[PDB]
Amino acid sequence: KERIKINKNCKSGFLRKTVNSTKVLEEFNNSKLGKKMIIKKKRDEATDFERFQVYFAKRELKKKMTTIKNKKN
């Protein structure tokens, strides 16, 4: 989606200066596709203990969430 307006003849210094100015990567990170990509990147790099911790956390959540489902009726 994002675009930055620049003069047509520009080279690497000006491109670096402009990218640093406009902070487009932050806009990308905020963007939903970017956000899906960065979440996936974390998941890809996650260690064995980290993987267990995600399992354990989801297990705690299901216990609490099911208890809330009991609560609601």
Binding site: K42, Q53, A57, L61, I68, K69
Partner: protein
Amino acid sequence: MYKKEYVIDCKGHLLGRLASLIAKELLNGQRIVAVRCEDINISGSLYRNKLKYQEFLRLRTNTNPKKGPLHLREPSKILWRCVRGMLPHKTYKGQLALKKLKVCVGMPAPYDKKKKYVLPSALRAFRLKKHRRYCRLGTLSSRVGWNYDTLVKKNEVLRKQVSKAYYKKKVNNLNEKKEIKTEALNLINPEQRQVLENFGY
């Protein structure tokens, strides 16, 4: 593949590619239910396809049509025949692959309860240009007199409406599950909750 049954929604899929992908899977090993098979696309025009089917009808036998070829009229059987062409069906290995394939026009309801997959490279959109003529296989079959069409049209509509009622119920259920999950995310211990958030909840 690595699963008991692939069900394929064959609407919008191009004949040759759809057949080839199914065939290699059958050869690899897989039971495959081809579903919704009148809405398959041929890349030729309606007249051109009618001409081809005319040539197919013309092919018979002088001797005795009791020992002649089969001019199957079902759109599902047309796909089946094409897949058979893409198998070595006079072998045992080919026959076993042939037996693994199941074909159905429209959505049979026991396999509509099941999940439907698609073959993403094989869509009409995917490998054909917009400005070039094509023809739907059911339309062609109707042109050459298969004529079991209106019943399927009614059945598909009734199934689809129920599917809409199902989809809204599913959406209701998913929204409620999201709501309870978000509420009970607060109740998780902070560090564990932070980790679960980090990895995308």
